Amino acid sequence: GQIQLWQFLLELLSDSANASCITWEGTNGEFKMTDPDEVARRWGERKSKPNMNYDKLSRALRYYYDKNIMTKVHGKRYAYKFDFHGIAQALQP
Amino acid sequence: GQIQLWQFLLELLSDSANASCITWEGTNGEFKMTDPDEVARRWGERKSKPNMNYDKLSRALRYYYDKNIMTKVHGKRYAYKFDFHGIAQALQP
Ligand SMILES: [Co+2]
Numbered sequence A, B: 001g002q003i004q005l006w007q008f009l010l011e012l013l014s015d016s017a018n019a020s021c022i023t024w025e026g027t028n029g030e031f032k033m034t035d036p037d038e039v040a041r042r043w044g045e046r047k048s049k050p051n052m053n054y055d056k057l058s059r060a061l062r063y064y065y066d067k068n069i070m071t072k073v074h075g076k077r078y079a080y081k082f083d084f085h086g087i088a089q090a091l092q093p
């Protein structure tokens, strides 16, 4: 059904078989997209939106910064951090 | 519906109207039970297990240590920390 981008990333992150494109790395919440192109592609497939690429995926994450769901780590690139404040709220109907 | 203990605490944590019994405090994932007795009571009601109390609630959480869902902050009391490793896995069917 209707799965959301943040949920998709935790799905990918939940299995180290996906490490070639995405993996936890760092302290609580921190991950890196080892292949952002591949992560965008897989999302596009899942949400049957085959116009999806990395630029569009990066834009959609921007929405999540103001919701406190996650935040981009400035300085590093392709690095991000899930925040429990917003995730706990996003987890609610 | 049938809801899980870790799921229940995130629900409570999602709303600061519950601060009198449970609140985020600290860095990513860190929380403390301002009223552990109240938290156990509300759980018992939710899972229709009216034998529930703090001692049993703290037992149930110990299960989550080896699942990496959460950990107890040693040296403090009633302080805990949700881990995104285990949570990402717990969200999976
Ligand atoms: Co936060």
Ligand SMILES: [Co+2]
Residues within 6 Å of the ligand: A028, B068, B083, B084, B085, B086
């Ligand atoms: Co961890």
